[PDB]
Design a protein around this ligand. Sequence first.
Ligand SMILES: [Ca+2]
Ligand SMILES: [Ca+2]
Ligand SMILES: [Ca+2]
Length: 317
Amino acid sequence: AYGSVKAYTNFDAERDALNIETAIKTKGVDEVTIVNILTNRSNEQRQDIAFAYQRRTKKELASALKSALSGHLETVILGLLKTPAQYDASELKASMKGLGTDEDSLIEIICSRTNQELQEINRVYKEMYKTDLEKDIISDTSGDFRKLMVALAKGRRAEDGSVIDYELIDQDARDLYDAGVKRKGTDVPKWISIMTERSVPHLQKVFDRYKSYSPYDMLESIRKEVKGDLENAFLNLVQCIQNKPLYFADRLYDSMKGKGTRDKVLIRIMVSRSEVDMLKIRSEFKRKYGKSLYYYIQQDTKGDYQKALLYLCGGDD
Ligand SMILES: [Ca+2]
Ligand SMILES: [Ca+2]
Ligand SMILES: [Ca+2]
């Protein structure tokens, strides 16, 4: 409901598949037409176009476009063609490269996805790679960090209940302070337990009730009590629970603020959150960093790649 790319009203899968077939078979490849079409269609509509294209040409659209395109634009388009679950699962599999695992992407995806999304992701992952996500998480992670990632990826977080339990909120804040800053050392399993099991609004009110018992807020308490992968995961998780659009705005900023561009993160965010809360991310981004997201994307990317990302953004703020 808060996505930037909406379902195209006057949609016709057959003509889109025709125009795309034409744009592909065009000499020198017509990237502009492909971008113009795919970036203004909903994911489901893109699936419809894929099916129509398949019936028309008896070749799958993703293959033809992987042949017709290259580089970052290829990455973006092939990212858009997949269903949300498929894309997330594929990114997760890509992030797990043994001991040199990209833990940043892994954290980004596992910490920010909801119960339904994770439930679908586990199934699709198992169907795609004939192996449960948990086995690979265990294989490519270790320790309390592993435990946390496994807990989160199980996707059985409690749902937001009818009634607000302020008492349990208070007791959770107390438990968090007692297991963290109060004692020397850290009771990590209790932290993981509370942060993975309780619902999101409950954990918001808990995170702000924690400010009453502790001299440091939740983020700083994390920066002090634990460090490393565990720390990064806890930080990202808390950022997501508190303010997810702001979190993704910060993640977008971090991907472009420095030298070059962390295109994996940029592309993944602009694709996965295009039909979710891209409007809110734009809002938070301009509210915090002065200029629009469109602007940063414009200054840090060029060409039809830039064009695609700008279409996924949806105008200047
Ligand atoms: Ca290629
Ligand atoms: Ca301590
Ligand atoms: Ca840059």
